[PDB]
Amino acid sequence: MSEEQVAQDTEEVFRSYVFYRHQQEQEALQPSSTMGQVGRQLAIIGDDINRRYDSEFQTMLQHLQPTAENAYEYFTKIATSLFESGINWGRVVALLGFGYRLALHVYQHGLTGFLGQVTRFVVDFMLHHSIARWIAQRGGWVAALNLG
Amino acid sequence: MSEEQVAQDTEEVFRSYVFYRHQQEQELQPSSTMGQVGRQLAIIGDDINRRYDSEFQTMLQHLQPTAENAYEYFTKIATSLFESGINWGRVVALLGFGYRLALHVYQHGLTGFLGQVTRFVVDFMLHHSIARWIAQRGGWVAALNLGN
């Protein structure tokens, strides 16, 4: 094959890999293309391997604490170090999983960060819209403990 | 009590609400009264939040809230929610809206960043001979014979 054609198919292989990888994580039809089948075959083949490395990567990746603004530099360093001592099909799959896990940890950092934005939405709205005074006049938040 | 004290406790009531609701969504004792309130409100209406799950998930996907328009939409919806009355149920509804809104905002973020990571993988495999390595071995489809 051509080295250009492989790169174009990789986008389709990685999307399917992230899909079927996520689907077998959630739960734990046939793809409409060959690259979609490849990404699916690679996700299911090593399901048992990715789980034994699950606790390790979940802890180490939360140590790295990757964000949207530093995700590229960490991907370049880690990917480079991954293939420095050789390239085999297993390390290619590992590159796919790293992109999968990296995207997960980036937007767990984002949601937790945005959940603080929404928290300020609620606090300020209840303050400036008498919702807090409504609850204050009825005995504070603790009053809701008698519901149910 | 004063509405100032209520606003300060709301941040802790909402954080606990998002916590214990999520825990029951996927799947001790709080260390304070406000943490218990957010927990009491989350478990009391689990079956109600479940019957409204498909409707709010579809409607919020229609809204397509982002981090840059989440405040405009939160202020309009909260105002319209309390325009025709304030009761304890509508207060709980405001908490759930903040919970779902933060989720749908970063469903948009994950899919958006999954395209950033995709460009990471494609470009790295291109500029680091990984694509040529697989191309010289028969393209992505060759990986379909792994696993037999």
Binding site: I45, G46, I49, Y53, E56, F57, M60, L61, H63, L64, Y74, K77, I78, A79, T80, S81, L82, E84, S85, N88, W89, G90, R91, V92, V93, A94, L95, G97, F98 | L146, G147
Partner: peptide, 23 residues
């Protein structure tokens, strides 16, 4: 030691084990 170096390492045995049981 370094976190970046440790993650790249665990990706290697990652793939090498995968490559050993499927390639």
């Amino acid at each position: 030691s370094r976190i970046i170096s440790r993650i790249a390492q665990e990706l290697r045995r990652x793939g090498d084990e995968f490559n050993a049981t499927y390639a």
